[model samples]
Target chain A: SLTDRITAAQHSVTGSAVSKTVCKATTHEIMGPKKKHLDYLIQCTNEMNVNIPQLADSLFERTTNSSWVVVFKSLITTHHLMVYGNERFIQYLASRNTLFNLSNFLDKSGLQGYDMSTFIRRYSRYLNEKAVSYRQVAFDFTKVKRGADGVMRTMNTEKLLKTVPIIQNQMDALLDFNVNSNELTNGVINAAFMLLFKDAIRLFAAYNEGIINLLEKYFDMKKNQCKEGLDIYKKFLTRMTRISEFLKVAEQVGIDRGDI
Target chain B: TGSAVSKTVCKATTHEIMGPKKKHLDYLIQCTNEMNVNIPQLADSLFERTTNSSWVVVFKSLITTHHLMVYGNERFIQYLASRNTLFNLSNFLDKSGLQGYDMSTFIRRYSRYLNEKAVSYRQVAFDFTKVKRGADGVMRTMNTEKLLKTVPIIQNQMDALLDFNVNSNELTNGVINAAFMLLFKDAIRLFAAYNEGIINLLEKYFDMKKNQCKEGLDIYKKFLTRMTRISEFLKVAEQVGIDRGDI
Candidate 1:
C-alpha cells in the first residue's frame, strides 16, 4: 500500500507529454504535499523489517523529476536513522573504550574506503582515550538533568564537544569522497550523507560554543581552528538555506515552460 | 649485626625525615580536604576564568588540583611507602628500559615543582572565595588586597623550595623517593603516548613529515635512555639499606 502511494507520487512528476504540463503546473503546486507523502512512506517503511537498500534504490531510480533530489535525500536520511538509531548501535558508539576495537565497529557499520574509514576510526578512538584521560584526571560529564517538559536527560557537555571533531571530519571526508568518485550513485549517496552529517553537527555545535572556547584556550589554538570548528557548522546551516533557494529557482524554470 | 646496621640506617634516614615532615604533611592534608569540599565551586571559577580570558586563574586551578593530589593526598603517600619497599619498582621498570643513571637534577627539579605547586594550591584554596559572582551575575569581581597578599607568599615559598636544593641525596634517594621515581616514570609514559599520538594524527590528517616530529621524538628517546640508566643504578644500589629483592 505504501509502495503504491509512493509510486503514484513519483508518476505525477515523471513521464511524457501530459506529464510535462503537470510537472509545470500541478506538480509545482503540490511539491510540498508530494514531499510530505514521500516522508510518510519513508516513516512507514522504516517501521517495517524492509530491505532498506532495495527500497531506497527502487524509490531513487523511479523518480525522474526535479523533485527526485528532495525525495532521494529524505529516503536516505530515514534509512540512515533506521540503521544507526538502534539501541545496540548507540551503545557501541558510547562504549568504544579501546582504539583496537575501532576497526571492529567500522567493519560493523560497513564503512569502506581507506582515508575516510581510518579518519573516523582513529578520531573516535582519540575521543575515547581523551574522555578516559579527562576522567582519570578528575573531569566527569555524565550528570543528569530535567528539561522544561520534565523529560529526564543526561547533560554531557564534554562528550558533546568531544563528538564535534569526528562529525566535522566525517563531513570533510564525505565531501572529499564525493569529489574523487565519478558515479551517479556516489553523488546520490554522498548528497544524502552530507545532509545528515550537516544536520548532526548543526545540533551538536548549538549545544555549546563555550565548550569550543574552553578547548580553544586549553589547546592554545588558532582562531581559524576555532572558526572552522564553529564555521563548518555555519556553512552547514547556509547550505540548507541554499537548497531551498535552488528548489525555488527550479520551480521558476518549470513555470517558464508554460504548459509544454 | 646486619639487621642492627639496617635498623640504624632506617632510623637515621627515613624516620628522621618523616618525623619532621609529618607536621607539614598533616597541614597539607587539612588544606587538601578543605579544597576537596570546594571542588564544584572551584570548577565554576575555572569556567569563569576561562570565559574572562584570565588564563592565570585557569592555570592555577588545574595545576593546584594536580599537585595537591600528588603531594597531599593519602593515596599518593601510600604509593610512596610501597615504592620505598620496591614493591612497585616493576611498574616503572616494565617498559622503562632505564637501568641506572643519576639524573638527580631533573628528578629534583620535578619534585621542586611539586612542592611549589602544593604551596600555590594552598594559596588558591585560601583565596577561592575571593572571586565571586556580583549581583549582576558576572564573575569579574576580585579581592585585590587578598590577591596582592597572595602573590608575595607564593613568590617566597617558590624561592624557598628552589633554594632548598631538592637534589640533596637525603631528599632524592630518601623514603619518598619511590613516589618521585614512579611519578617520573609515569610522566615519561604519558609523554611518549602524546608524542606518538600527535604525530600519528598529523601524519594521517595533514600529511605531515615524520621528520617534522623527529626532534620531539628524539628528546623523548633521550629521556627514556636517561631514565633507563637511573633504573639500572637503583637496581644495584643495595647499600641504600632497603629491600634488595634479589637484585
Candidate 2:
C-alpha cells in the first residue's frame, strides 16, 4: 500500500505531458508551461497554511529555460545506463553546479507536509549548520585570548588537540562523505560516486512520490489518475530509445575513447 | 578565676550547640571499623582526634559556629542559649595553655566580630552563584564582579578560621580548623565549577569548532590540573594533619 502510494505520488510530478515536453525541448525552448507547474507546486504550500516566500522566490527567480536544460541533463545523465557504464562521468556530474542546484531544489520541494520529506529537510538543515560550525572551529583554532600578561596569544594547545579529533569525527558523522576529494579517475572514487548517485536517485524518486501525494491530497487528483501518471513516469524511465539517453551514451564513449 | 557557671551547665550548653556529643565519637569508631567517610564531610570528622581533652570544647565551639553558618541563627540559637555564652571563650582557653583567661569578655567581644563577619561573608557567598555563567549562553550563575569579590572573601574567612593560636603539642585546634578551612575552600571551588557548567561548555565549544584548538586543549588541561591540586592537598591534609591552611 505504501509503495503504491509512493509510486502514485511520483507520477504526478514526472508522468505529466509537460514534463515530457520540457524534457524533449532544445535549450532555446521556452519553459513557460513547465514554470507554471513549478509555480503550481509553490501555490500548493498555501493548502498547509504556510506562506514560504523564500522557497517560492528561490524557485521562481531562477526558473529560466537554461535551468530547465540543466535539470533534464541531470535526469538524462544519471539514468540507469550512465550509472553502470560511464561511471567517472557520473562522478563529475555529482559535483556539477547545475545538477546540484536542480537536485537541491527538487529535494526541498518534493514533499511539503509529510514525514519523509520532513525528515530530509531536517537532516539537510543540520548538515548546513554543521558546515557553519566547521568554519567556526577553524576560525577559533587560530583565535587568541588575551591573558593577564596583556599579550594576545594562542590558547593552550592541549584541549584543542583533544578537541580537534572529536570534532573531526563529529563532522564526518554529519556529512558522511568527503566532498572535497580532487581525484576523478580512481576506481574507488568512481565506485563511491556510483553509490552516492544511487542513494541520491533513490531519495529523488521518494521525493517525487511525496510531491504527487501532496497534490493528490490537496489538489484532488483521483486515485486511478494518480496510478496512470505513475505508470507513465515508469514508462518514461524504462524507454531506451529516448534521444537524451543516446546523447549520454555518445558523450561517455567520446570521453573514454570508445572504452564504453 | 573562672565564672560561677558549673561544668555541667557548660557541658549542657555545648551539647545543645553541637549535636549530642555521643555521635561526635562515632566518627572515630567508624574509621576504626575502616569505613570510608564521604569526601565532602571529611572536614567535620577531623576533630575526632581531640576527643576527651579541653580541645573538645574548642572543637565544639567551631562546630557550633559551622552549624550557625549552615542552619542560621534561629535553628542555631533555638533554646535558652544567648550569643554571649554560645561563643564562650572558656571553651578555647587551657587548650591554648593559658590561665585566668576571662573567657566571658572574649566571647562577648568575639560575638560582635562573628556577627559582622558572618553577615559580610554570607552576602558574598549568596551572590556567588548569580554571576557564574552556566550553559545556554546566559550568565545563569555567578558574574565576574561577584565571583572575583566572593572568592577573596571566602579565602579571607577561611584564613581567619585557621588563625586560632595553638600551643605546641596541641594538634586538635590547628588540625580541626585547618581541615574546616580546607573543606570550605574546596566547597566554594566545587560550587563554582558545578554552577559554571564547565563540562557542558567544554563539550559545546569543542563541538562547535568541528576541530579542536590547541588553546582549548590547554584550557581543559589547566582545569583538570587545578582540580587535581585541590584533591591532592585534601588527601595530604588528612594523612599528615594540616599544619596551616592555604588555597
Candidate 3:
C-alpha cells in the first residue's frame, strides 16, 4: 500500500507526456527552493559518472521492487530527509533569537520549559521526530551503497521543505516574548531558539542554491560544469539577493512591528 | 464431610480459577493446598487412566484452553484451573508442533505443591527414557530434568531466530540478548509470516507483477495483531513453516 502510494507520488512528479509548464509548476510547488540544491547534486553526479545511462540504469534497477522491497523503503526514506529534514528550521531560530530575548528562544523552543517534566516531555517529541528523519535519510540505498553525496541527496531536499513549520513555530514562540513574563533573564532561552532558527534557514538556502545550480548544469543540462563553473558561482548572487530580501522582511517583523 | 469438603474445595478452586471481574486470583492458595493434599495423585491418575484415549477425548478442550491463556484470554485459563487446581495435565502434549511437548511452567510450578503430598510419580519423573525413538533407534527421555534442560535449549533457539538474516549480526545479537522470551519468538515469527502473507496476498489479491514497497503496511497490521496473540500467532507462524526447531 505504501509502495503504491509512493509510486503514485513519484509518477505525478516525473509524469510522462505532461505539458512542460504544468509539470514545472507542479515540480516547483512540490520541491520549493530545494530544487536549486537538487540541480547541483545531479550536476555533480554527471561529472563523476563515466557512463551516465549505466549509472541511471543501475540506480533504477537497484531501486526496483525485485530487490527486497528496498526501492519503496528508499523512496519514502529519501522523501522525508530531502524535504523535511533540511537545515532551514534551525537557521530560522538563530535570527529570531538575535532579534528577540536570547533566553526566551530556548524556553519557547522547549529546551527549558517552565517546569522540567513538561520541558522534557515536549522536547523529547521534537528530538524523536529528528531522529526518525535522520534514520530515514541515513539508511543506505542499495544503489548508492557507498554513500550519497549532496548531488544524489533526494531525501535532504524533502526534509528541508518539511522543516518550515518547526522553524516558524519555534521562532514565533521566541519572538512573542511580551505574551509571557517579561523577566529578561527568563527570556534568554526562547530568544536563542529564534536566533538559531534564522541561521539554520539562511545556511540551508545558501547551501541548497549552490547544490541546485550545479545539479542543473551537470545532470539536466548535461553541461560539463556551467562554462568552467562560473554559472554556479553566479547563482550565489541571485541567492544573496533573495536572502537579503528575506532578512529585510524578517527584521521589520522583529523590530518595526515591535512584537518581540 | 467428604462431599462437602470436596465441593467446598471445588468451589474455592473454581473461584480461584475463574476469579470475579476476570481477576485471576493467582491460585496461590491452591498452590498451598496442592502442596498439602492429594491433587498431584489426581493429576497423575487422570493422565495414567486416559493416556491411550487421553488425547482423543479431551485434547481439543485442553489445547483450546492453553491457546486462550496465551492469547490474553485469562478467563478460560482461570475457568479450567478452578476445577483441576492446575492447567489440564492430560493435554500437556504440543498440538502445533509434530512433537507435542509444551507445558505452562506457571501451572506446573503450582502443581508442584501437590506433588510432595501423595503421588510419588517416580514412573513419570525418573522413568524418562526418550518419549520417541529416533531413526537410529536412540532412546530419549522426557523427564523433569530433561524438560528443565530443554528450556535453555529452546531459549537458545529463540536467540538464533532473532539473529538469523539480520544485516548487522552484532546489532541483532544484542537485541536477541535483551529480548524477552515470548517477545523474541514473536518478533522473529511475525517478520517471517508477514513477509510470506504479504507476497501471497499480493499475488492473489492485488495481482501485482512484482513486489511493491508500500505493501508492507498491510502486512504490518496483520503482524501487529499476531504479535498481540502469542500462542495463536505461534501456530500461524508454525503453519508458515518458519520455525527452525533448533531446540
Candidate 4:
C-alpha cells in the first residue's frame, strides 16, 4: 500500500509533465472540438499518485538532464548506495528554497490547489529525507560518543581496514557515470544549465547510495568476535571522523558555491 | 527583541559570576534559550535566602513567588521549563506527571516541590551583574586569565559529558521521548571503545557479521538480513531509473 501510494505520487508529476505536452497536442487531436485533456490528466494523476514513491528513485535517476550533468560527474563523499545493506542510514534536510516555495510552481497549467499542495508537500517530504538519511549515514557520530567495552574487544578486523581505502576509491568511480539527457526536475526547477541546485543533490545521493552499498559489503565481510551495540562501532566511527568531517566540510562548501 | 529573535551568545563569564553554579546556570540558560525556561524565577532565585525558618516555609514562599510569577507570565515558567528541559533538569515533579498521575492534589504538591528545588538549585548560581562591580556602577571584566587557570576543570567536565553513561534528567527525558536514543547509543559505544584504547577495531566486526549471512542464525540477524536484502532490491530499482518509492 505504501509503495503504491508513493508510485502514484511520482506518476502524478509525470502526468503533469504529460499534461503540459497534451495541451499543445490538444490543438490537433480534437475529435469533438471540446479540448478535454481532463480525462488524460486525471488518469495520469491517479496513476502517478499511487506510484509516487516507486517513481522517486527511478525518476531521480531519469531526471539528471543537462542541468546537473556536472554535479553527477563531480566527486563527493556521501557513501549512499555503497552501504546499501549496511545498518547505517543517510539523512538530509529540505533545501530552504524548495521548502519555502509553493504557489510559484502552481502557476503551471495542471499543478493547482490540492494537486499543488500535495505536490509541494510530497516534494518537500522527499527533500526533507536528506536530513534523515544524512543522520543515518552519520551514525558514527553517535558511536564515537558511545564507548567500546567488554564485548567489542573480540571483533576481528585487520582485513576490513586493509580493504576500506580500496573500497572507498572504487566506490568513488560510480560518480563518473553520466545520465545527462535525463530531466533534472520533473516540475519545479527549470533554471538555465542548472535546474535548481537541489536536484543535483538527489543525483549525487543516488551515486552516493550505489557506492556505499559496495563499500559496506566489502567492510561487512571482515568479522571478528566483536561486541554488538554502540561502543565498538563508535570507536570504529571515531577513526573515521577526519574523513567524515572533511566530506561534510566539502559538501557544505559545494552547497555554498551554488552552481559548482 | 521578538521572543523568537535569535540569541547572540557571548559566552562571557562575568567576573561577578564564578564557580560551578554559574557555569551550570550558563549551560542551563543557553539550553533554555534554545527552548523555554523560567528566567524570572531563575534570576530571583539567584539570591539565596539569608535566613531560613523552615524548609516547608522557605519552599512555600519560594514556590508562591514562582507560582505568582508563572501566573503573571506563563512564558517565564515555560522558559524555565524549557531551559530545564534542555539542561535535562525538569524531573523535580511536574515532569513525573507525564506518567499520568490520578491524584490532582499529589500533582499540585509535587509541582510545588519541583518549583522549590529548581529555584533553590538555581539560586546558588553567581550573579553576573554583581560580580565585582566597578566604580562606574558597571560590572568589572571577567578575569578570564584567572579563570583560564581552571581550564582543566572545565575541560574535565566537558570530557565527562562526552563519556557520561549516567542517565541524567535530560538524558532520561530523551529516553522517555525517544529523541536522541540513537545518538546516545552511539555516544556510549564510542565511549566504550575509547575506554578500551581499541578505537577503530570494531568496524571489522561489522564487516564480518555483515558477511556471515545465511544459514538461519538468530531470528534477529535473519530478519535483519531479509530487511537488508529487501532494501537492496529496492536499491536496485533505484539504480535502474526508478526513483519514486524510496521514501
List the per-model TM-score of the A chain: 0.29, 0.20, 0.23, 0.23
Using Cα atoms with residue i matched to residue i, what is each candidate's TM-score against the true structure? 0.28, 0.27, 0.18, 0.17
Tens-digit per-residue lDDT, B82-131, candidate 1: 22121111111112222112322333343444444345445455311122
Tell me the TM-score that candidate 2 gets on chain A alone.
Answer: 0.20
Q: What would the per-residue lDDT of candidate 3 be over residues B1-247, giving only the tens digit for each residue?
A: 2333334323322312122111222232233244344443323323332232222222322222222233322333333344434433422443533222222222232223222111211222211111233212211223323333332332332233333221222222211122222333434433332223322322232122223312322333333333234334334435534343611
Model 1 regions more than 4 Å off:
A1-34, A43-54, A60-194, A202-260, B1-107, B126-172, B175-247
Which wins on TM-score, candidate 3 or candidate 4? 3
State candidate 1's DockQ.
0.02
Model 4: per-residue Cα lDDT at residue B213: 13
* DockQ for all candidate structures vs. native: 0.02, 0.01, 0.00, 0.01
Candidate 4 root-mean-square deviation in Å: 26.6
Candidate 1 residue B156 C-alpha distance from true site, Å: 19
RMSD of 2: 23.8
Off by over 4 Å in 4: A1-244, A248-260, B1-50, B73-247
lDDT of 2 by residue, A59-178 (tens): 223333234333332232222212232223323333233322222333232232122222223233323333343344432211123222211112222332333333333323323432
Regions of model 2 farther than 4 Å from truth: A1-140, A143-260, B1-9, B12-54, B72-117, B122-140, B143-148, B158-232, B237-247
Candidates sorted by DockQ, descending order?
1, 4, 2, 3
Measured on C-alpha atoms, candidate 1 has an lDDT of 0.33
Model 3 chain A worst lDDT run, 10 consecutive residues: A97-106
